[PDB]
Ligand binder design. Structure first.
Ligand SMILES: CCCCCCCCCCCCCCCCCC(=O)OC[C@H](COP(=O)(O)OCCN)OC(=O)CCCCCCCCCCCCCCCCC
Ligand code: SF4
Ligand code: SF4
Ligand code: SF4
Ligand code: SF4
Ligand code: SF4
Ligand code: FES
Lengths: 208, 180, 586, 226
């Protein structure tokens, strides 16, 4: 129920294989402590592409307060950032810039596609748009929407936190196994199918 | 620079500090997602479902109007027919990684089958899991339109509704009838 | 006579003046639904006509637009000169409150026009875009390089034989050699951009990743110490191909793409497109539709102005009004979600009306917003806008007069801070804006950053007044016109009448058939003047969709106004323009 | 032959009728009961135009362009108000008994009646009474029958009997209860009966082999083949 990824510099320059979860009880507790610290302090790269970035900085404001999750520092440097939110369209002139900024980020790093443009190109199936940011960089969380509302971005933040909290990474670069192990978690569609199909009645659209 | 300008600027900095302090003495404007559930209006354009008629059958007649009215083209379906003669989707898939949640498919539906529900929590880990098939879209009730049935309006004869049993329709008169 | 009727405008005094000056056989008058006199001028007389219009007793002082059209696939070209391509020039005389559209016909092989930059400096970027997208060469241009697409691009995207969709092309593969080659193309070279370089002129790179809400873009700066001696903006990093999608989507299905032209505008962006399509369809919308569209336009205008003022204050250095202004944006978003069902891109305007009726309880939410807004605005002024540090950062920074605003096509608050009272809502009224009592604020004559910001505050107050008038006087009636081309028809008649079902079926599947004509609508957007110029060839898709945006003009006006200033002055000037890069590139 | 349509001069063939001559010039006149291969009968009363006696005439008279020869010096108007109103009225009369069937109809998006309803500009229903209904017949494995959608344009019987020479399809009944089909349930015996799916301007006769795996016309990938 895990995937093993090791990188060695077409993009992405990684190869993944399905592997059994390896997990002493002290090493496991240290791994959960490291994962807890990584998931409760996630610093996003302040990267503005399009309208989805306007919704992201709406999520950062007072009526939403994304600071409650410890994800508010909003670094302008990719070295100091933990999370790349592709919040906008992957234009062909901007795609090498996105690749360069993602390369300049440091491990551990995670990617959230925010919006239909970053997911698959969205409505812009046009000559000057890369059809999704997963064509050239690996994505951890996808948010459908055009735009997603700010609480959808927070929901993806919680999904990323839950994905980090059960993934395995080396504690030190001199001791252990240096490959990155990511959990193959259950899809949210199959998890929410029980509560979504049973919905019967909704409020009529003629009211407030 | 002028001394009067310096004093006025100092007073303005003090006023700004004072106003931010009184704003600290104010009421919090934050909606505490997810502990506080997000209120959405009934016509909010979120997660797309397919609904059912009040009789319990699925409302979609597989007429492909939503697929062609989609500006992204992220709806795919195929018409199938029952033995009685009613139309239904053999499958129905929406690529939610492509969908812009614009509500044009719901606006184009002549049976009020496809609907956009007030649900935004749709995040996913893999993009292949964002393709929602008919099993992930067909819900147990009528949704936002509790009483509309297209097959009560249509002239086609199906199970439980023969010719002339629809709204504003008369019984069929045979050409062999004795009346002039 | 309705306002959508086809007119040749032979009663315009400019037509008689051109008859008396150049002769009757020198040009062809075209009857359109654009509302403007369209004159097909021969190519060798184009600069003469431009000089004559610039030297009129009431001169045509502003080049509103300049672009091209591929006429090869156009079947209904009756009453028109023979052409494979054409170049159109939209020129505005503010003193007459009139405008004229010159058109130059071009063959497929001889695709060269004399340049227009000696008369209007905005023709630089307009002709660069026309060369980039149509391949039309302009003789005498200082530098005719691509402005939207990279320099290593083959073909011109807006030609009719160029495939529109990315799925037509190969999927995007990023290899090591491809990444190196595209990174080499984005490198700046002083000689190619016409910098015209002293052993001290350093070069500065600003973008293309941009820590602000208004898009991602580059500025390359020539510096003597800290002084900006020259600069040229690099745009096209936000190009979405929206006009090519206008040729690719039907009339009804293009409205979501019209939403994302200026993504802080929403229904303000939807308004000129649906007005131009209704001109093409011969649809006069009822008064309730006009009041609803005015109300939503003013709501989104207040949203955009709130974001602009908050972003300007944040760029000065005060970071709290962005929190409070986004709370006010959340109140506006509550009302907009209640009415349309979406926050930023409602796509709620329709050909002939709006998608739904107003929901029960809209007046309550409008009342809460109208009670909430003015105290928050006054707190914004007292906390940040009257701060002397903000005034020192803003006043006197990147200032220009009426002549520089007129020659560069600057509109909106930047034009009106020069003292020129020119708002579309009062000069060329649209969508029933003549029934609303509101004032147009103007400046003293100098366009500082602070003057533009205070003007946008004043238009926020006037939009609050318009919203109050909309709340007090909303007519009872239909939310859709009774025209046969109202797309889509009212939903319940579609659900129980077979002819209405047929109309809806054909309008949402194949599209509604607009008769072959040309239409034009310019509106006062949240950031200036936004216009749609729509050419229909009689089909269910647009033959040509031309979207004129003011942010293009303002980004082109940047090097003339920021020259000789500091880099922080450039940051303040960027924060005080009220642009977005989707508006620039689109 | 010289005709004048809406004040514009055209050169046509005098042996042709006005409908085919005006359609050859690119003008749009709605029509149901006329087919190029079948000739003119003047049944559906949809192709009405306003003919004038001379050039300086204002009253005119409603004539039918399929039944009127396109002779030399003809003066007609298509966009006349009375002609447009009559064509919209004819579409409305055809729409009084039409079933609410377009989503579940194989002719949807490929329907001549849909195109002529949109072209005449008829989108408001004021008829409030009942609609006549008809039972269907089993016409074999190739043709599907749905008589509720008929507009009584007599194209099927004219093609099948006069052109194709078939015997087992006909028109039965009376005033508004006209039925088009076989005298009894059975397979259509003509070797060219499949052309009824394109001859019929409505969805009465449909391709059952296509109706099994049905998709709309706009969703088709087409090719020219032999
Ligand atoms: C290195 C620094 C050198 C300079 C400073 C030296 C030390 C301080 C010496 C005294 C300074 C007095 C300044 C002048 C006070 C009276 C004038 C004044 O307040 O001017 C500022 C401003 C003027 O109004 P205006 O900007 O035109 O706005 C339109 C509204 N009429 O009016 C306003 O903004 C409204 C009134 C604001 C009053 C603010 C408080 C003034 C007194 C401050 C005393 C010290 C407070 C210390 C901090 C306490 C809180 C933490
Ligand atoms: S998905 Fe929609 S809202 Fe997000 S960047 Fe694309 S166009 Fe803008
Ligand atoms: S909401 Fe819009 S983009 Fe999404 S499936 Fe419906 S029509 Fe397509
Ligand atoms: S428009 Fe409605 S009835 Fe037609 S195929 Fe789509 S969901 Fe089904
Ligand atoms: S025959 Fe034409 S008008 Fe009648 S139900 Fe079928 S598609 Fe609709
Ligand atoms: S069945 Fe079809 S072809 Fe025959 S009369 Fe009726 S509408 Fe015309
Ligand atoms: S086509 Fe002429 S009356 Fe039918």
């Amino acid at each position: 129920d895990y995937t093993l990824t090791r990188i060695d510099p077409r993009y992405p320059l990684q190869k993944q294989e399905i592997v059994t979860d390896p997990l002493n009880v002290f090493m496991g507790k240290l791994n959960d402590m490291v994962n807890w610290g990584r998931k409760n302090s996630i610093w996003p790269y302040n990267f503005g592409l399009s309208c989805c970035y306007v919704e992201m900085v709406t999520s950062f404001t007072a009526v939403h307060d994304v600071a409650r999750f410890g994800a508010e520092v909003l670094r302008a440097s990719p070295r100091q950032a933990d999370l790349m939110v592709v919040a906008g369209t992957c234009f062909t002139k901007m795609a090498p810039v996105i690749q360069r900024l993602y390369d300049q980020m440091l491990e551990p790093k995670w990617v959230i596609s925010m919006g239909a443009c970053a997911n698959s190109g969205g409505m812009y199936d046009i000559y000057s748009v890369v059809q999704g940011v997963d064509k050239f960089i690996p994505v951890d969380v996808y948010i459908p929407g055009c735009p997603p509302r700010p609480e959808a971005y927070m929901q993806a933040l919680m999904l990323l936190q839950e994905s980090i909290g059960k993934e395995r990474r080396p504690l030190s670069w001199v001791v252990g196994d240096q490959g990155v192990y990511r959990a193959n978690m259950q899809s949210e569609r199959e998890r929410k199918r029980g509560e979504r199909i049973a919905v019967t009645n909704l409020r009529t659209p003629d009211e407030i | 620079m002028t001394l009067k300008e310096l004093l006025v600027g100092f007073g303005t900095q003090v006023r700004s500090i004072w106003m931010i302090g009184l704003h600290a003495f104010a009421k919090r404007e934050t909606r505490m997602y997810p502990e506080e559930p997000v209120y959405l209006p009934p016509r909010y354009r979120g997660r797309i479902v397919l609904t059912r008629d009040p009789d319990g059958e699925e409302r979609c007649v597989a007429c492909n109007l939503c697929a062609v009215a989609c500006p992204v083209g992220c709806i795919s379906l195929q018409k199938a027919e029952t033995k009685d003669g009613r139309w239904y989707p053999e499958f129905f898939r929406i690529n939610f990684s492509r969908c812009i949640f614009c509500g044009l498919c719901e606006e184009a539906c002549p049976t009020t089958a496809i609907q956009l529900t007030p649900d935004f929590e749709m995040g996913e880990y893999k993009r292949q899991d964002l393709v929602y098939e008919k099993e992930d879209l067909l819900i147990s009730g009528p949704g936002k339109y509790p009483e509309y049935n297209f097959y009560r309006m249509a002239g086609m004869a199906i199970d439980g509704k023969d010719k002339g049993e629809a709204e504003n329709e008369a019984k069929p008169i045979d050409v062999k009838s004795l009346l002039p | 006579e309705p306002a959508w009727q086809t007119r040749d405008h032979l009663d315009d005094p400019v037509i008689g003046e051109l008859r008396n000056r150049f002769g009757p056989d020198a040009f062809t008058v075209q009857a359109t639904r654009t509302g403007v006199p369209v004159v097909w001028i021969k190519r060798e007389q184009l600069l003469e006509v431009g000089d004559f219009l610039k030297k009129l007793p009431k001169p045509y002082v502003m080049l509103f637009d300049l672009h091209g059209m591929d006429e090869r696939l156009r079947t209904h070209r009756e009453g028109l000169p023979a052409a494979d391509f054409s170049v159109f020039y939209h020129l505005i005389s503010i003193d007459r409150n009139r405008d004229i559209m010159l058109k130059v016909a071009l063959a497929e092989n001889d695709l060269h026009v004399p340049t227009f930059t000696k008369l209007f400096p905005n023709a630089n970027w307009y002709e660069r875009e026309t060369w980039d997208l149509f391949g039309i060469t302009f003789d005498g241009h200082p530098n005719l390089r691509r402005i939207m697409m990279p320099q290593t691009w083959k073909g011109h995207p807006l030609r009719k034989d160029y495939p529109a969709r990315a799925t037509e092309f190969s999927p995007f593969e990023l290899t090591k050699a491809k990444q190196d080659l595209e990174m080499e193309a984005l490198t700046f070279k002083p000689e190619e951009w016409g910098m015209k370089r002293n052993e001290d002129f350093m070069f500065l790179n600003l973008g293309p990743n941009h820590p602000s809400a208004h898009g991602a873009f580059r500025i390359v700066l020539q510096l003597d110490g800290e002084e900006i001696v020259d600069c040229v903006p690099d745009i096209g990093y936000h190009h979405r191909g929206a006009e090519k999608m206008g040729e690719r989507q039907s009339w009804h299905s293009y409205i979501p793409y019209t939403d994302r032209i200026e993504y802080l505008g929403g229904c303000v962006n939807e308004m000129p497109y649906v007005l131009a399509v209704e001109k093409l369809a011969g649809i006069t919308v009822p008064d309730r539709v006009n009041v609803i569209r005015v109300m939503l336009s003013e709501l989104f205008r207040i949203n955009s102005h709130l974001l602009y003022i908050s972003t300007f204050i944040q760029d000065v250095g005060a970071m709290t009004p962005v929190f409070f202004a986004f709370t006010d944006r959340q109140k506006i978003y509550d009302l907009v979600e209640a009415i349309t069902g979406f926050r930023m891109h409602p796509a709620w305007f329709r050909i002939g009306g709006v998608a739904h009726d107003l929901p029960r309880g809209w007046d309550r939410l409008l009342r809460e917003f109208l009670d909430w807004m003015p105290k928050r605005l006054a707190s914004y002024e007292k906390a940040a806008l009257q701060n002397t540090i903000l005034k020192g950062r803003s006043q006197g920074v990147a200032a220009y007069g009426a002549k520089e605003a007129l020659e560069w096509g600057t509109t909106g608050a930047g034009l009106r801070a020069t003292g020129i009272d020119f708002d579309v809502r009062k000069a060329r009224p649209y969508s029933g804006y003549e029934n609303f009592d509101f004032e147009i604020p103007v400046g003293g004559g100098v366009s500082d950053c602070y003057t533009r910001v205070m003007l946008k505050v004043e238009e926020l107050r006037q939009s609050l007044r318009i919203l109050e008038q909309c709340l007090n006087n909303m007519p009872e009636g239909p939310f859709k016109a009774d025209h046969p081309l109202t797309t889509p028809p009212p939903k319940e008649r579609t659900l129980q009448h077979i002819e209405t079902l047929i109309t809806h079926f054909l309008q949402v599947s194949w599209g509604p058939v607009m008769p072959a004509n040309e239409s034009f609508q310019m509106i006062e957007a949240t950031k200036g003047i936004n216009s749609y110029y729509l050419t229909s060839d009689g089909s269910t898709m647009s033959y040509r969709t031309r979207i004129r945006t003011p942010s293009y003009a303002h980004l082109q006006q940047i090097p003339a106004a920021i020259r000789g200033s500091l880099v922080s002055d450039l940051i303040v000037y960027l924060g005080s323009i009220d642009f977005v890069m989707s508006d620039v590139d689109r | 032959a010289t005709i004048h349509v809406d004040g514009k001069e055209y050169e046509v063939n005098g042996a042709d009728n006005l409908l085919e001559a005006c359609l050859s010039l690119g003008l749009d006149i709605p029509y149901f009961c006329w087919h190029p291969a079948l000739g003119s009968v003047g049944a559906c009363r949809q192709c009405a135009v306003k003919q004038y006696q001379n050039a300086e005439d204002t009253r005119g008279r409603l004539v039918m362009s399929c039944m009127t020869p396109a002779s030399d010096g003809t003066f007609i108007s298509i966009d006349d108000e009375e002609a447009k109103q009559f064509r919209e009225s004819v579409v409305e009369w055809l729409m009084t008994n039409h079933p609410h069937d377009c989503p579940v109809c194989e002719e949807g998006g490929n329907c001549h009646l849909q195109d002529m309803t949109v072209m005449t500009g008829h989108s408001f229903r004021r008829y409030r009474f009942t609609k006549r209904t008809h039972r269907n017949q089993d016409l074999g494995p190739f043709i599907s029958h749905e008589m509720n959608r008929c507009i009584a344009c007599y194209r099927c019987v004219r093609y099948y009997k006069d052109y194709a020479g078939g015997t087992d399809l006909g028109v039965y009944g009376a005033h508004d209860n006209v039925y088009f089909g076989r005298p009894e349930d059975g397979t259509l015996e003509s070797e060219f009966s499949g052309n009824l799916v394109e001859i019929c301007p409505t969805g009465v006769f449909t391709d059952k082999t296509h109706s099994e795996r049905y998709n709309r016309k706009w969703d088709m990938q087409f090719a020219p083949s032999i």
